[PDB]
């Protein structure tokens, strides 16, 4: 199991959350903010992500742009927040799964993703 991830870049370093999930067993993939809207999309579809990660609600607000009329889509995604507050930001965009990793450790996580996987093969049969 060697789940997909997408990060957006944020004050923190991005080097250092890659290594982290890297670590475990995940996929890492970086793309920085700059990115013209439709990129987002394009990604998502193409690589099959399972999780997408934001260091912050400014990076949250980017993504939102980047999505641009397929938001109702790319929402499906399990979207990581570092904070409480963070994740309230998510749910207000209509996020339809929100995850907080404030509480919950790195391996836990990963636990998270393959999780989330496993109801991407119900809806095909």
Same mark, same amino acid.
């Given at each position: 199991m060697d789940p997909k991830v997408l990060i957006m870049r944020g004050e923190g370093g991005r080097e250092f959350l890659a290594e982290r999930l890297r670590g475990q067993g995940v996929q890492v993939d970086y793309l920085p903010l700059d990115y013209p809207a439709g990129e987002l999309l394009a990604r998502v579809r193409a690589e099959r992500l399972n999780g997408l990660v934001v260091s912050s =609600?400014?990076? #949250?607000?980017?993504?939102?742009?980047?999505? @641009? @009329?397929?938001?109702?889509? !790319?929402?499906? #995604?399990? $979207?990581?927040?570092?904070?409480?507050?963070?994740?309230?930001? &998510? %749910?207000? $965009?209509?996020?339809?799964?929100? !995850?907080?990793? %404030? =509480? +919950?450790? &790195?391996? +836990?996580? #990963? @636990? @998270? $993703?393959?999780?989330?996987?496993?109801?991407?093969?119900?809806?095909?049969?």
């Amino acid at each position: 199991m060697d789940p997909k991830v997408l990060i957006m870049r944020g004050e923190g370093g991005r080097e250092f959350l890659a290594e982290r999930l890297r670590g475990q067993g995940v996929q890492v993939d970086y793309l920085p903010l700059d990115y013209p809207a439709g990129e987002l999309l394009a990604r998502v579809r193409a690589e099959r992500l399972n999780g997408l990660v934001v260091s912050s =609600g400014q990076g #949250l607000q980017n993504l939102y742009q980047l999505a @641009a @009329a397929d938001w109702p889509e !790319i929402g499906r #995604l399990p $979207l990581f927040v570092p904070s409480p507050r963070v994740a309230e930001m &998510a %749910r207000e $965009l209509g996020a339809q799964r929100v !995850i907080d990793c %404030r =509480g +919950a450790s &790195a391996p +836990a996580l #990963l @636990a @998270a $993703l393959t999780s989330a996987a496993l109801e991407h093969h119900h809806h095909h049969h």
